[PDB]
RNA sequence: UUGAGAGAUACAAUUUGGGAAGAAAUUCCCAGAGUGUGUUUCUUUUGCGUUUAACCUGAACAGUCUCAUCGUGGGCAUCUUGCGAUUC
């Protein structure tokens, strides 16, 4: 039970440092974005820059249009390329605390008492089934 | 009691009831109001039950109000001998978490019975 | 570290070590739910678009976003301060805004947030019965809605009449859970939409915030007589 | 006035019929042919007709009423906007925390 | 804040330090916390204090 | 079988 | 289900009676019981196919 | 033509073109929403009137 | 019944309890006897094939000048059964279609006949006979009535949204249609249109506004009764029938009006 | 049955292409007037209103999620009410006919208020969920609604108001 | 070979809008559409889709006693060299 908390805690640690890791970063939109025309002709064209305004720059990413500088090119990309990867990674470390703090409990309800039968699966991912009997 | 809201109806209740206690054969579920906040904090519940019976029901109703901030299914039974009965302890049980497994036997059992939790909300 | 303004006046993308979305403040000074402040003399919140819907609307892209900083702006489904704070703050201090709810759990901290926001007036009472807040205010600029109700298009068309102004602006939330699960999100927006302009309301965009929440779509349109 | 009392007579009077002090003596000062008079709810039906009123609010009615408050605070008052607005937030404090408990 | 947390924690709302290290290293957490200043745990006496 | 009594035409 | 699982409870107290069956009756998996009409005499039959019979002595 | 005249026809008929990460639907007109009621789900009627002339019931 | 139970009924005093589905049957369950009321039980009493192919609806009605049960599936007849005689007395199946209002007619110059069903007209010429045309108008999307002009010039489709209007070319062993643009026709309702003249055509709008063109009769209202403001169409002008400037509209309340033109 | 013949009595028939018939019974059943549906229109039901002293309504559901008030006089709908949750099943009125029962095919039971003179339907209520079907309904008395699943099952619902299993 | 309808997906050409340069002719850059040749998903459609099957369940592991966990010794390095997880 005491190394079932270390890892529990290890868990929470990284878990919340998910949570507020990547509460304050920004992911882009993907929405169906649907725009309400007259009948043939406003169709049929390509909507005549009513949010485009440039139709370069502020056209395509839609996290900031727009209507009318330290290592722009690769550093600041390469800091948000690495603070996504952490959180990544931050990711695959609750995950895998995870699974082990399951398999560590597992055994831990498996040692205590009443009846129980070696459950064996398909594959060979054995398991374990308890008696219907309640506690006294 | 009125100020338990979703209240299971008799057909939904018994299902509710027998996932809970296949659940409690397999170890699946932690019983009990504190165990089932614990369940909460730690994110490791797929649906909660409740027991609109007990006499302070404000013993309970404060885990709603951290289902409402973490999206998980909870719902309410009529009485919490019963759910203690099905439970399979031997005292009145005020609520219970089925906590989360993925190559349990139940999944499926689990699945149908919190989406039938979460159409009435 | 440096702060491009947006489309929307109110609305600024604070740029640098991470580029993201902020409003300015009328609380000075302190956070009200722990949301990060970065501060450049003045000081900046940061909206979070999961925690809210607006920010995720603004995320996704409006351009016609009603919620401009010289309006005042009805708001039918805030219960809690999380989106009516940065409401006020790109409404700025000139205008008011209408937080109009009726579940009295969150209401608390609703009106203890109204208290240091005085751009914010608290309505408790339900947003399908404008006629017990009639004798509050009236004629606002625009509406937004974020109820998530069977009668959502009942609720809006009554406010928006008793309260909104001609060529005023509805921005709606939709959730497609809580109208029909069990078929696509597509025919529930759809026959919504045309819910909407079957009263005074021109429809003009939606989208459906697809990374931010999921099923739900936000519609805006123009309020026609 | 901006007396409390009066704020929530005002607002009771608005959740229930409205035959309190303010529109009972509105309705007996404007005596003089039993006009045609336009109530702002329809649920105020004694307070509509219950003493001498031809009494109507029916769908223009809330087009009149649009545009009645949309131009209260500039001329029919002698105060303005932010008169309007302090009394009317104070008012939805008063309110507030008379329903909401505390 | 308090009434959304469990009796555990409500035990052992005091004594995060010695938790926190009692954790980080499995050793065994304390059981008093800032409820030991109550009046009915000063007048138990021995290990039924932590009971 | 049709309904045919005492009643009156299309009028009250 | 269980080995030796029979109690006789005692009503209207409702209390089980202590002293039978105790940890050496040979109750078995018992699966079927019968009290007769008479003479207050009670007979088990357990999974080993065992009709054990006691007799009441109060009747 | 007769091969592709159904492709012509509804190329002329549809609505909401996709420009780009954008789509524009056309509205309806108010006519036809106060003259008619919708149509109908035509897969759930699809659904009851199969179960009616189901195979389970040897229908002549 | 042998398969499902689609649609069932009951009477007044719950005495009989009528029900049918898909194969094709009735059934009645009786409760008359007062030895079934006291003791609550059910009897199947009877049971009668008179349908063709199912039974999707059923009602019944029960007054002093009438008993009967009403039927209908998915062969298209209706069918009337008396209720306290069910079984006992005779039955009456309407016919599939009784035409109060027509949907085919005739023009004798040209020796020719149109038809509408739902939005297409069809029109064969005879001689033998050979069909003509069709016009799948699919901008059309209800169709009512509609008129053929005298000499086979213009035809009239007409709904209660809009109305179109055809001139045709006879050319052989086809004819040639084209339309033609007229937009109070298009902006107000039509329910029959009848020709007064091989150009000008008197017309009946569902608000019941009269119109004569190619132009605006006033009709004297009648006093509504009780039941006419329960039933908010028979003062309503039903017919209209015109040859050579003087017609005769008629409302269904009992009431038909002459009008010369 | 104990009263004499109402002169307002009639019938009204849906079909599946979509257009409604009204009969009157009076010697052997005259057609008074069609309401014709137009394409891909449908009438899986529909249901009558007549409170005590005010016009007819006729009300009734396609295959979809509406609910459609017809003005008898043009044969035109005066109202398309979009039922505010999945397709329409079924239908049915109150005793005293001011609500408006609908099953629809997510399980749900709505209910719409009538009781606002003719033209004019309110949501109400939504009823206490479930997952199959509802495929038929029907009232009690202003009390319960009765309705019958395609699980095999028929719930019955309780839509007294002021009371607390409402 | 879903009889068919609607969708994403590479090439071949023809283009539409917004900006750059030039006298234009045109060229450069940016966002896309539609057309034939392949791959693929969705909805009926007739032989028939299986009308049987699935999964749960009752006292359903355990005399050749079964299981758990902590230790010990050995085999497999010609490789199960063994994860807070059963390698035998």
């Not at chain 1, 169906?32 to 043939?40: A, E, G, P, Q």
């Not at chain 1, 690769?74 to 609750?94: I, N, T």
């Not at chain 9, 409760?31 to 063709?52: A, D, Y």
């Not at chain 10, 609500?99 to 009823?127: A, F, Q, W």
Request: hydrophobic share 35%; proline share 3%; net charge positive.
């Amino acid at each position: 039970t005491q190394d079932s908390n270390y890892v529990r805690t290890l868990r929470q640690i990284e878990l919340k440092k998910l949570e507020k890791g990547a509460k304050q970063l920004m992911f882009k939109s993907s929405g169906n974005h649907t725009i309400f025309v007259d009948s043939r002709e406003k169709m049929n064209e390509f909507t005549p820059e009513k949010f485009f305004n440039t139709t370069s720059e502020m056209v395509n990413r839609s996290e900031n249009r727009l209507t009318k500088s330290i290592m722009p090119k690769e550093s600041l990309d390469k800091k948000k390329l690495k603070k996504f990867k952490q959180v990544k990674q931050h990711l695959q470390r609750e995950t895998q605390l995870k699974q082990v703090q399951q398999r560590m409990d597992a055994q831990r309800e498996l040692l205590k008492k009443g009846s129980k039968k070696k459950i064996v699966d398909s594959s060979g991912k054995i398991s374990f089934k308890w008696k219907k009997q309640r506690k006294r | 009691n009125p100020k338990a809201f979703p209240l299971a109806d008799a057909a939904l209740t018994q299902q509710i009831l027998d996932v809970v206690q296949q659940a409690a054969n397999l170890r699946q579920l932690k019983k009990g109001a504190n165990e089932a906040t614990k369940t909460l904090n730690r994110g490791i519940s797929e649906f909660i039950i409740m027991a609109a019976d007990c006499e302070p029901i404000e013993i309970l109703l404060h885990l709603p109000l951290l289902c409402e901030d973490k999206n998980v299914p909870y719902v309410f039974v009529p009485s919490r001998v019963a759910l203690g009965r099905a439970c399979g302890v031997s005292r009145p049980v005020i609520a219970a978490s089925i906590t989360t497994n993925d190559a349990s036997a139940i999944k499926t059992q689990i699945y149908a019975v919190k989406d039938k939790i979460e159409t009435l909300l | 570290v440096v702060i491009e303004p947006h489309r929307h006046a109110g609305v600024y993308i604070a740029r640098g070590k991470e580029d993201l979305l902020v409003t300015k403040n009328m609380a000075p000074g302190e956070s009200v739910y722990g949301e990060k402040r970065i501060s450049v003399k003045v000081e900046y919140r940061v909206w979070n678009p999961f925690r809210s819907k607006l920010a995720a609307g603004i995320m996704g892209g409006l351009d016609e976003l009603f919620i401009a900083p010289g309006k005042k702006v009805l708001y039918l489904g805030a219960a809690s301060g999380t989106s009516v704070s940065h409401v006020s703050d790109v409404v700025g201090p000139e205008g008011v805004v209408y937080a109009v709810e009726f579940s009295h759990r969150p209401g608390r901290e609703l009106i203890s947030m109204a208290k240091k926001r005085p751009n914010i007036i608290p309505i408790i009472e339900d947003a399908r019965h404008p006629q017990k807040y009639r004798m509050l205010i009236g004629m606002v600029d625009c509406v937004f809605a974020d109820v998530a109700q069977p009668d959502q298009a009942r609720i809006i068309a009554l406010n928006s009449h008793m309260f909104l102004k001609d060529q005023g602006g509805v921005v709606i939330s939709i959730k497609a859970n809580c109208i029909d699960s069990t078929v696509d999100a597509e025919t529930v927006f759809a026959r919504e939409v045309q819910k909407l302009r079957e009263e005074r309301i021109k429809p003009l965009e939606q989208l459906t915030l697809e990374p931010y929440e999921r099923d739900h779509c936000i519609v805006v349109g123009r309020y026609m007589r | 006035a901006a007396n409390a009392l009066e704020e929530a007579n005002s607002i009771i009077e608005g959740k229930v019929s409205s035959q309190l002090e303010k529109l009972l003596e509105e309705i007996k000062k404007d005596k003089k042919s039993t006009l045609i008079v336009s109530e702002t709810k329809l649920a105020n039906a004694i307070n509509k007709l219950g003493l001498n009123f031809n009494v109507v609010s029916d769908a223009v009615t809330l087009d009149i009423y649009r545009a009645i408050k949309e131009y209260l605070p500039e001329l029919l008052p002698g105060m303005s906007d932010n008169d309007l607005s302090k009394m009317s937030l104070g008012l939805a404090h008063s309110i507030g925390r008379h329903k909401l408990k505390f | 804040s308090l009434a959304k947390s469990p009796a555990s924690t409500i035990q052992i709302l005091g004594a995060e330090k010695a938790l926190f290290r009692a954790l980080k290293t499995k050793h065994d957490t304390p059981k008093y916390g800032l409820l030991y200043h109550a009046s009915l745990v000063g007048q138990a006496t021995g290990k039924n204090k932590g009971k | 079988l049709t309904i045919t009594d005492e009643s009156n035409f299309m009028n009250d | 289900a269980v080995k030796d699982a029979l109690r006789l409870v005692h009503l209207p107290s409702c209390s089980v009676f202590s002293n039978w069956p105790t940890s050496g009756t040979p109750l078995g998996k018992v699966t079927s019981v019968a009290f007769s009409p008479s003479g207050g005499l009670l007979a088990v039959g357990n999974e080993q196919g065992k009709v054990r019979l006691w007799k009441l002595n109060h009747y | 033509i007769k091969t592709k005249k159904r492709k012509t026809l509804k190329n002329l008929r549809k609505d909401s073109v996709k420009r780009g990460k954008f789509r524009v639907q056309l509205l309806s007109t108010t006519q036809d929403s106060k003259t008619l009621p919708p149509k109908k789900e035509s897969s759930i009627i699809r659904s009851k009137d199969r179960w009616l002339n189901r195979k389970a019931l040897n229908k002549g | 019944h042998d398969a499902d139970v689609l649609c069932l009924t009951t009477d007044t005093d719950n005495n009989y309890v009528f029900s049918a589905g898909v194969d094709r049957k009735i059934f009645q369950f009786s409760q008359n006897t007062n030895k079934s009321q006291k003791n609550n039980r059910w009897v199947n009493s009877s049971n009668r094939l008179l349908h063709g192919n199912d039974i999707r609806a059923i009602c019944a009605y029960q007054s002093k000048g009438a008993d009967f049960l009403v039927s209908g599936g998915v062969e298209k007849t209706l069918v009337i059964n008396s209720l306290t005689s069910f079984s006992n007395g005779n039955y009456r199946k309407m016919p599939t279609v009784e035409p109060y209002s027509k949907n085919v007619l005739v023009n004798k110059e040209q020796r020719l006949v149109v038809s509408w069903s739902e939005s297409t007209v069809k029109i064969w010429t005879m001689g033998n006979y050979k069909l003509v045309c069709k016009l799948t108008l699919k901008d059309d999307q209800n169709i009512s009535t509609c008129s053929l002009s005298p000499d086979g010039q213009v035809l009239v489709v007409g709904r209660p949204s809009t109305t179109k209007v055809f001139h045709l070319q006879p050319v052989g062993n086809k004819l040639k249609v084209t339309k033609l643009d007229n937009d109070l026709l298009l902006r107000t309702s039509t329910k029959l249109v009848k020709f007064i003249d091989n150009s000008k055509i008197v017309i009946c709008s569902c608000e019941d506004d009269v119109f004569i063109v190619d132009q605006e009769v006033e009709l004297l209202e009648v006093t509504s009764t009780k039941s006419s403001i329960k039933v908010p169409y028979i003062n309503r002008i039903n017919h209209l029938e015109v040859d050579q400037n003087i017609a005769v509209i008629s409302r269904g309340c009992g009431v038909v009006d002459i009008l010369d033109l | 049955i104990n009263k004499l013949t109402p002169s307002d009595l009639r019938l009204a028939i849906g079909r599946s292409n979509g257009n409604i018939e009204i009969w009157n019974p009076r010697n052997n059943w005259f057609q008074e007037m069609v309401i014709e549906g137009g394409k891909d229109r449908s009438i899986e039901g529909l249901c009558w209103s007549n409170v005590n002293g005010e016009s007819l309504r006729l009300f009734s559901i396609g295959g979809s999620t509406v609910v459609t008030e017809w003005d008898l006089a043009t044969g035109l709908p005066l109202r398309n009410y979009d039922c505010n949750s999945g397709v329409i099943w079924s239908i049915s009125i109150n005793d005293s006919q001011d609500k408006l029962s609908v099953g629809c095919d997510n399980g749900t039971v709505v209910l719409i208020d009538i009781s606002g003179g003719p033209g004019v339907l309110e949501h109400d209520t939504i009823l206490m969920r479930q997952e199959a079907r509802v495929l038929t309904l029907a009232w009690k008395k202003d009390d319960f609604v009765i309705g019958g699943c395609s699980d095999g099952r028929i719930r019955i619902w309780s839509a007294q108001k002021n009371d607390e299993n409402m």
